[PDB]
Swiss-Prot record, chain A:
Belongs to the SLC3A transporter family. The gene is SLC3A2. It is found in: Apical cell membrane; Cell membrane; Cell junction; Lysosome membrane. It is a single-pass type II membrane protein. The keyword Ubl conjugation applies. This is Amino acid transporter heavy chain SLC3A2. It comes from Homo sapiens. The chain crosses the membrane at residues 26-46. Acts as a chaperone that facilitates biogenesis and trafficking of functional transporters heterodimers to the plasma membrane. Forms heterodimer with SLC7 family transporters (SLC7A5, SLC7A6, SLC7A7, SLC7A8, SLC7A10 and SLC7A11), a group of amino-acid antiporters. Heterodimers function as amino acids exchangers, the specificity of the substrate depending on the SLC7A subunit. Heterodimers SLC3A2/SLC7A6 or SLC3A2/SLC7A7 mediate the uptake of dibasic amino acids. GO terms for molecular function: aromatic amino acid transmembrane transporter activity; cadherin binding; double-stranded RNA binding; exogenous protein binding; L-alanine transmembrane transporter activity; L-leucine transmembrane transporter activity; neutral L-amino acid transmembrane transporter activity; protein heterodimerization activity. Changing N222Q: Impairs both the stability and the trafficking of SLC3A2 to the plasma membrane. One of its GO terms (cellular component) is melanosome. Changing N347Q: Impairs both the stability and the trafficking of SLC3A2 to the plasma membrane.
UniProtKB/Swiss-Prot annotation, chain B:
Its main location: membrane. GO terms for molecular function: amino acid transmembrane transporter activity; antiporter activity; aromatic amino acid transmembrane transporter activity; L-amino acid transmembrane transporter activity; L-leucine transmembrane transporter activity; L-tryptophan transmembrane transporter activity; neutral L-amino acid transmembrane transporter activity; peptide antigen binding. The keyword Disulfide bond applies. The uptake of leucine, tyrosine and tryptophan is inhibited by the different iodothyronines, in particular T3. The uptake of T3 is almost completely blocked by coincubation with leucine, tryptophan, tyrosine, and phenylalanine, or 2-amino-bicyclo-(2,2,1)-heptane-2-carboxylate (BCH). Methionine uptake was inhibited by the L-system substrates L-leucine, BCH, L-cysteine and by the MeHg-L-cysteine complex and structurally related S-ethyl-L-cysteine. MeHg-L-cysteine uptake is inhibited by L-methionine, L-leucine, BCH and S-ethyl-L-cysteine. This is Large neutral amino acids transporter small subunit 1. PANTHER family: AMINO ACID TRANSPORTER, LARGE NEUTRAL AMINO ACIDS TRANSPORTER SMALL SUBUNIT 1. It is found in: Apical cell membrane; Cell membrane; Lysosome membrane. The heterodimer with SLC3A2 functions as a sodium-independent, high-affinity transporter that mediates uptake of large neutral amino acids such as phenylalanine, tyrosine, leucine, histidine, methionine, tryptophan, valine, isoleucine and alanine. The heterodimer with SLC3A2 mediates the uptake of L-DOPA. Functions as an amino acid exchanger. May play a role in the transport of L-DOPA across the blood-brain barrier. May act as the major transporter of tyrosine in fibroblasts. May mediate blood-to-retina L-leucine transport across the inner blood-retinal barrier. Changing A203V: Nearly abolishes leucine transport activity. The modification Phosphothreonine is found at T2. Changing Y74A: Strongly decreased leucine transport activity.
Length: 471, 464
């Protein structure tokens, strides 16, 4: 009618046979093309591989633990009890820690066994109605509380060098009593002085897991050789065991790589605990240039990282006179240490380091945020590969998620990377370039993609490169 | 041979509800949390976008009863500003705005349909693309068959959307019914309320994606039964329902999950169903997949009727607006609005075409209401069945100018690229409409291909 025919002459012309055959053929062709595309989508969906099942993690698989040895040296004088511990539970939420290993708070006189009760709190830390208040206040912030039950924590021999099995029956009786009050785990330290240790640990593990499967039991030795550690872990295998296995080196990267790979190969790639001691700080073993390099390693290895209080600010008991090394004073502010008013600086405090974006606490917060979030660091797979003289380089990769490449230079002089990979399976091989998430030293652009053949490492530097699932 | 009005009052309520409630209540309740920080101000953002959409819908309801022609927001600009602005709106609404919206909603349908086969991983992209191209091709053939079949699809899936959202709301009510508070505390709901407002605007810009489509019944008037009663009655019944369901869904999202697991989630409804159901939690991805199935039907139904009316004014070729007799459906316009939607299956990242034309999408709604006020003080005697209380349009004009002013002072990067699309649409106007004295080299070829497509699809021209 406007630029075409009208109804009359159209139905006159376009009603002939042949013109009906064409439109019926085109309708049949449309529906055959639709049923071709549907079967194409089906055989594309079927020829997609699969994707893997999540390994049903616990709560201590998710982030780090935080050991608080002395409760008085954590806050200070006056408020050195369990009621004052409730005020710091948002600083602990800033660190994104998932657990809290409270020190031994029970009534221990001294080496008399009969005057040591594990069911009663010493009055210098508070009472039980303060303790369950702390527990309920920590449950609100998603923080679990672990209770250390080492009996003779005021003497020199922690398991009472006199009578042996009677002091273990009162641990067996205390596990049940404290588990109904609502604690989420236990810790026993110095079990190289415990007689029949591998027999008692299996009994306490079967008691603790017989309550719930959301329950932890940590053990601690001062041992450093692998065959003595493996003797404790051959009967029970869900046991977390902190020790001084990585303490020895403080040194070259080939030895640290051999220690980590030999442990992971000897234990059969189980869930382990990565640490440097059972109760001590990182500055007791490492010089101050290797703290950032070890913090990057302990957050990116396949296990639970366990730290002490003050490890995020680099607390040092040999930098201030008149403090015990087993319990230094936590430098919250500039008024924390009352003697010698001026020995404490501003970069040695919590609030003085929460302002610097290139501090030590600012590295801890970024790494602890990255660990508790990404699936390749939560339950990824470990693969270390060969590199230059003094490097430790490895890769985490879960299924199809964002992969991670950690490059650590323990040496004193700089060198290149030389990442001759040649060893990884096809799901995690290196691309020609990768991002940069983090570096332990200033002087690099955090976010811009480098390429992994002219990578240079300056002294004591560590890198956290990143790349996605591709060819 | 006309279009044979079929749309009831309840069918209009179904059209508006089914087009509005699509993907944005499932793939966006995070953006407002990541640029608002606190769960109180996010609810403030959702309520504010609700009030904004309600007042704009009331202005468009009284516009659509005043002028009363199909192709709303285009017919109004044609009656007010003339020929060239109406063509420029029609042109970039035919090129970019409708075929990107329909393809994005079809892709979200395909992804959340194939999600239960790939529970914690990524869906393969050429398997979701090829199902998104099946959804459009099936709905464009259902719409070409009949009109009442296309309105039965729409209210069946509009009932399915409401039964899928009511289950989430009652799952949240029994989560608050067992006495535990992860969020929604009295005094602990505002920690991290991002102030400055500078970052907020971006937010208000994120919560308005879920409210889009409220002006779609204005495209499909002249097909309602008794439109002077049944257009505003279908608008003021449909739209205050959505602003209530949209806050009772987000606060029920806030009872179960926390702010650290919501911001680390890419599918909030899937993480809701995983906690509240465990196994038999596959019904939540298939019910947010069927939510995006009824939003492509309601937007292919009105996009065809827009290009229908764009051809009756001479702004388009006349093969569009040719009704197939005895089916009484605009077949050559539905084929066009399907082919344009399937052409966007070559785009890799078209989610960022939203910032390209968000300024013009609100500039048209501002220009329509300026002309609405201008028509009242120029032709002050027409049959106005519903008149609006004024200073709600005065509020809406400067509110749309505030929403367009953040496109030029905060992110003016791609707006100059977007303006070149309109000014490249201008010579198309001149060549197509203005250039008369046409040579017979081209006009007879145009007649020959028009009669060829006419004999192929068996369509006759309109005629009162
Ligand atoms: C896809 C299959 C769908 C099935 C149904 C077939 C429908 C055909 C779809 C065609 C869609 C076209 C939409 C846009 C049309 C704009 C033009 C117009 O409005 O004309 C009205 C005008 C109305 O004609 P009437 O029907 O006689 O009133 O249409 C024409 O005269 C023919 C226009 C053909 C346009 C073909 C594409 C040309 C693109 C621009 C070419 C460059 C122009 C400038 C040259 C110098 C460049 C530097
Ligand atoms: C790119 C463009 C120009 C090509 C257009 C091709 C169309 C997509 C094809 C697909 C099927 C074809 C037609 C097949 C036969 C006709 C008649 C019609 O037959 C009936 O159902 C009416 C008979 C009855 O009511 O009993 C079905 C739809 C229609 C218009 C179809 C319209 C669309 C056609 C021309
Ligand atoms: C799960 C989803 C993604 C797959 C597709 C959903 C439905 C299975 C499809 C299949 C065919 C569709 C429709 C095809 C045409 C109509 C015919 C209609 O019957 C009529 O009233 C119109 C018949 C006429 O006018 O003569 C009722 C069912 C309906 C809506 C069908 C309902 C189901 C639809 C939407
Ligand atoms: N609210 C809906 C829902 O399902 O949530 C319901 C249906 C509907 C109808 C119209 C609409 O207008 C959006 C718009 C207007 C002017 C210029 C660009 C765009 C644009 N649409 C996009 C879609 C997906 C990705 C990017 C997009 O950019 C949005 C929605 C979504
Ligand atoms: C934990 O150890 C106890 C024994 O030390 C195991 O419990 C025994 O189970 C058998 C079989 O029912 C009973 O006949 C014994 O009386 C139980 N002894 C008890 C309760 O002291 C128990 O099976 C062990 N747990 C696991 C997981 O193996
Ligand atoms: C763990 O600490 C103890 C005490 O500091 C180390 O010395 C042992 O002390 C006990 C008595 O307390 C003796 O019975 C052992 O014979 C001592 N060990 C040796 C090797 O003489 C003990 O060596 C430390 N463990 C390690 C692995 O160094
Ligand atoms: C570490 O893994 C390697 C291989 O996975 C083990 O090395 C083999 O040990 C057997 C003896 O058990 C030798 O006969 C093979 O020659 C060794 N092969 C290689 C390639 O070294 C090794 O036993 C594992 N480490 C531990 C502590 O078990
Ligand atoms: C905190 O900052 C002070 C300076 O503000 C550091 O003191 C420097 O110490 C090194 C080595 O002891 C000296 O070589 C510098 O000369 C000192 N600086 C000045 C200005 O005298 C101090 O070491 C910093 N503390 C930490 C833990 O990094």
């Amino acid at each position: 009618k406007f630029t075409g025919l009208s109804k009359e002459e159209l139905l006159k012309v376009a009603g002939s046979p042949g013109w009906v055959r064409t439109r019926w053929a085109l309708l049949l062709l449309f529906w055959l093309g639709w049923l071709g595309m549907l079967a194409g989508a089906v055989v594309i969906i079927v020829r997609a591989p699969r994707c893997r099942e999540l390994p049903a993690q616990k709560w201590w698989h998710t982030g780090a633990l935080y050991r608080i040895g002395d409760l008085q040296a954590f806050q200070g004088h006056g408020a050195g009890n369990l009621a004052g511990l409730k005020g710091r539970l948002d600083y602990l939420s800033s660190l994104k820690v998932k657990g809290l290993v409270l020190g031994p708070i029970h009534k221990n006189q001294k080496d008399d066994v009969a005057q040591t009760d594990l069911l009663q709190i010493d009055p210098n830390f508070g009472s039980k109605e303060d303790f369950d208040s702390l527990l309920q206040s920590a449950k609100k912030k998603s923080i679990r509380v672990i209770l250390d039950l080492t009996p003779n924590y005021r003497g020199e021999n922690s398991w009472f060098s006199t009578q042996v099995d009677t002091v273990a029956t009162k641990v067996k009786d205390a596990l049940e009593f404290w588990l109904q009050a609502g604690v989420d785990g236990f810790q026993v330290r110095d079990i190289e002085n415990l007689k029949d240790a591998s027999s008692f640990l299996a009994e306490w593990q079967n008691i603790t897991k017989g309550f719930s499967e959301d329950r932890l039991l940590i053990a601690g030795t001062n041992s450093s050789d692998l065959q003595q550690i493996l003797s404790l872990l051959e009967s029970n295998k869900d046991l977390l065991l902190t020790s001084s296995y990585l303490s020895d080196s403080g040194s070259t990267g080939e030895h640290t790589k051999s220690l980590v790979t030999q442990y992971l190969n000897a234990t059969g790639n189980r869930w382990c605990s990565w640490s440097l001691s059972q109760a001590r700080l990182l500055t007791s073993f490492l010089p101050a240039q290797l703290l950032r390099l070890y913090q990057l390693m302990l957050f990116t290895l396949p296990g639970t990282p366990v730290f002490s209080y003050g490890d995020e600010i680099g607390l040092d008991a040999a930098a201030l006179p008149g403090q015990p090394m087993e319990a230094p004073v936590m430098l919250w502010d500039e008024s924390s240490f009352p003697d010698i008013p001026g020995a404490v600086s501003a970069n040695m405090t919590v609030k003085g380091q929460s302002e610097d974006p290139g501090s030590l606490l600012s590295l801890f917060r970024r790494l602890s945020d990255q660990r508790s979030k990404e699936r390749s660091l939560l339950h990824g797979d470990f693969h270390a590969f060969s590199a230059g003289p003094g490097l430790f380089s490895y890769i985490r990769h879960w299924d199809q998620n964002e992969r991670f490449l950690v490059v650590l230079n323990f040496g004193d002089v700089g060198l290149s990377a030389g990442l001759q990979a040649s060893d990884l399976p096809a799901s995690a091989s290196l691309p020609a370039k990768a991002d940069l998430l983090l570096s332990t030293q200033p002087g690099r652009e955090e976010g811009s993609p480098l390429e992994l053949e002219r990578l240079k490492l300056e002294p004591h530097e560590g890198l956290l490169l990143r790349f996605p699932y591709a060819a | 041979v006309t279009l044979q009005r079929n749309i009831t009052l309840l069918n209009g309520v179904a059209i508006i509800v089914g087009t509005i409630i699509g993907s944005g209540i499932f793939v966006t309740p995070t953006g407002v949390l990541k640029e608002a920080g606190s769960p109180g101000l996010a609810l403030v953002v959702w309520a504010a976008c609700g009030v904004f959409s309600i007042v704009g819908a009331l202005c468009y309801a009284e516009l659509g009863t005043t002028i009363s022609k199909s192709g709303g927001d285009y017919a109004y600009m044609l009656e007010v500003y003339g020929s060239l602005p109406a063509f420029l709106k029609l042109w970039i609404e035919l090129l970019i705005i409708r075929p990107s919206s329909q393809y994005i909603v079809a892709l979200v349908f395909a992804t959340y349909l194939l999600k239960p086969l790939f529970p914690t991983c990524p869906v393969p992209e050429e398997a979701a693309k090829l199902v998104a191209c099946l959804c459009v091709l099936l709905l464009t053939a259902v719409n070409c068959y009949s009109v009442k079949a296309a309105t039965r699809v729409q209210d069946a899936f509009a009932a399915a959307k409401l039964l899928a959202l009511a289950l989430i709301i009652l799952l949240g009510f029994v989560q608050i019914g067992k006495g535990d508070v992860s969020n929604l505390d009295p005094n602990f709901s505002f920690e991290g309320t991002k102030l400055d407002v500078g970052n907020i605007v971006l937010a208000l810009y994120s919560g308005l994606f879920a409210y889009g489509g409220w002006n779609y019944l204005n495209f499909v008037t002249e097909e309602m039964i008794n439109p002077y009663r049944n257009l505003p009655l279908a608008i003021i019944i449909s739209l205050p329902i959505v602003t209530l369901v949209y806050v009772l869904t987000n606060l029920a999202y806030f009872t179960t999950l926390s702010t650290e697991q919501m911001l680390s989630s890419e599918a909030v409804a899937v993480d809701f169903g995983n906690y509240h159901l465990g196994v038999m939690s596959w019904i939540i991805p298939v019910f947010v997949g069927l939510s995006c199935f009824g939003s492509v039907n309601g937007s292919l139904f009105t996009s065809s009727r827009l290009f229908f009316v764009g051809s009756r004014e001479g702004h388009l070729p006349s093969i569009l607006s040719m009704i197939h007799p005895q089916l009484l459906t605009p077949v050559p316009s539905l084929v066009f609005t399907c082919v344009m939607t399937l052409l966007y299956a070559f785009s890799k990242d078209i989610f960022s075409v939203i910032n390209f034309f968000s300024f013009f999408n609100w500039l048209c709604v501002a220009l329509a209401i300026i002309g609405m006020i201008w028509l009242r003080h120029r032709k002050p005697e027409l049959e106005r069945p519903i008149k609006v209380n004024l200073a709600l349009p005065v509020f809406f004009i400067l509110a749309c100018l505030f929403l367009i002013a953040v496109s030029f002072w905060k992110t003016p990067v791609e707006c100059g690229i977007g303006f070149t699309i309109i000014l490249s649409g201008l010579p198309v106007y001149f060549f197509g409409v203005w250039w008369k004295n046409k040579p017979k080299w081209l006009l007879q070829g145009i007649f020959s291909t028009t009669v060829l497509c006419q004999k192929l699809m068996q369509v006759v021209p309109q005629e009162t």
